[PDB]
């Protein structure tokens, strides 16, 4: 059971610093070198740093050289990554990965869950919920309605329908980062058109960071 | 610095079929040191093949690695339902380890045309100074689709964002939402708002529209 657990992620302003942690277990931590690998939103994987098993050598990637510092503590089975003068392109999910068996080379045989580092100047803001009213009345077979969760930061929001009773046909889209720096998504659901004038449709939006709860009624 | 190119971009196969992914390096990878990773949306990558052909611990036999020098190949003999994900190839024969852009293997199903819905901006949002017009494409396959916005029959560009769901776990479909963001001033200058959708499963473009007011 080789597991690596990351921590320390969160929101950080551009230019400021942030310290990540990686607590290991299930293997002899002092006999293996550990890496850091990051993955930008929607992009691919990029290697960041590496540290020897004894902490002697520490090599970095050119994108982060002179700004990031990798260190370890074999007594506590913990890896660190001190990130200084953070930039927008540093926003990514950071995984700590164990080094693999090789004569020369860095491949990653065991990864961690990863921690999200968001480099942004936005403040933690609650969402504004607006109804996506259907055009159907009866009109036809299946109508579609939904909620527009707009201008929140950071991720995520959780969206339920009718306090969880309505799950069939619910589509919640991945959030998109707007040009304002805030996130926005939509949650839609398909219902029979014959039930638009009888049933009540309420979307429940919950944003844990800003501790906001919005209940919006969606009516034709 | 070795750059890795993966082909194809997206591979559409059915469960039980044979999958072959290509990894092309700009320089020769020393000692055939190429690894393959599997990654599902929202999850961490995991190791499948190391050393171009040696298989990682706990990996099924259907996964197979081959290749040397500049061209490599990952092969899945019989595709299983849990094998549809993004696959990355990584070389570790140079000073900085480098990854490919990733190949996505996608579940292939029968063609389903999108059901198109359009939603006007709510009156509450119109009081804030911005208008959001939402066009909804629901349960379509394949993934390729076009959404063009028309405000008073004028082709809009640069003021819309598209979000797409992952391939649904039940019916292997996609859903897409195009959101046109306008200011309250620009929104009240025009009347006819419409999104025109074209899909390979639609004989004609489907257009939904409304008049402001």
């Amino acid at each position: 059971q080789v597991q690596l657990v990351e921590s320390g992620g969160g929101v950080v302003q551009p230019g400021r610093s942030l310290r990540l942690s990686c607590e290991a277990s299930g293997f002899t931590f002092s006999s293996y070198g550990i890496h850091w690998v990051r993955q930008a939103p929607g992009k691919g994987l990029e290697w960041v740093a590496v540290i020897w098993y004894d902490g002697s050598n520490k090599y970095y990637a050119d994108s982060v050289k002179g700004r990031f510092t990798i260190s370890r503590d074999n007594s506590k089975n913990t890896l660190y990554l001190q990130m200084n003068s953070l930039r927008a392109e540093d926003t990514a999910v950071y995984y700590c990965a164990r080094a693999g068996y090789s004569n020369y080379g860095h491949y990653f045989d065991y990864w961690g869950q990863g921690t999200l580092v968001t480099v942004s100047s936005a403040s933690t803001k609650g969402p504004s919920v607006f109804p996506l009213a259907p055009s159907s009345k009866t009109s036809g077979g299946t109508a579609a309605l939904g909620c527009l969760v707009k201008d929140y930061f950071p991720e995520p929001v959780t969206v339920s329908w009718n306090s969880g009773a309505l799950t069939s046909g619910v589509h919640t889209f991945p959030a998109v980062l707007q040009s304002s720096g805030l996130y926005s998504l939509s949650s839609v659901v398909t219902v029979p058109s014959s039930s638009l004038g009888t049933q009540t449709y309420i979307c429940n939006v919950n944003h844990k960071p800003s501790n906001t709860k919005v209940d919006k009624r969606v009516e034709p | 610095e070795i750059v890795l190119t993966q082909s194809p971009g997206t591979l559409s196969l059915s469960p039980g079929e044979r999958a072959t992914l290509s990894c092309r390096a700009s320089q020769s990878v020393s000692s055939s040191y190429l690894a393959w990773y599997q990654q599902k949306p929202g999850q961490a990558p995991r190791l499948l093949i190391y050393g171009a052909s040696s298989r990682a611990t706990g990996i099924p036999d259907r996964f197979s690695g081959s290749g040397s020098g500049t061209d490599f190949t990952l092969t899945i003999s019989r595709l299983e339902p849990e094998d549809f994900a993004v696959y990355y190839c990584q070389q570790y024969g140079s000073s900085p380890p480098t990854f490919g852009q990733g190949t996505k293997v996608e579940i292939k199903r029968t063609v389903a045309a999108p059901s198109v819905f359009i939603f006007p901006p709510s009156d509450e949002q119109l009081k804030s100074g911005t208008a959001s017009v939402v066009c909804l494409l629901n349960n379509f396959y394949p993934r390729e689709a076009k959404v063009q916005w028309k405000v008073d029959n004028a082709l809009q560009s640069g003021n819309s964002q598209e979000s797409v769901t992952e391939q649904d776990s039940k019916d292997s479909t996609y859903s897409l939402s195009s959101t046109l963001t306008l200011s309250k001033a620009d929104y009240e200058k025009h009347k006819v708002y419409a999104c025109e959708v074209t899909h390979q499963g639609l004989s004609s473009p489907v257009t939904k529209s409304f008049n402001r007011g």
Partner: peptide, 11 residues
């Protein structure tokens, strides 16, 4: 001091 050397013990 090889940046591409393996960082484990005695492998």
């Amino acid at each position: 001091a090889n940046p591409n050397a393996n960082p484990n013990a005695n492998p």
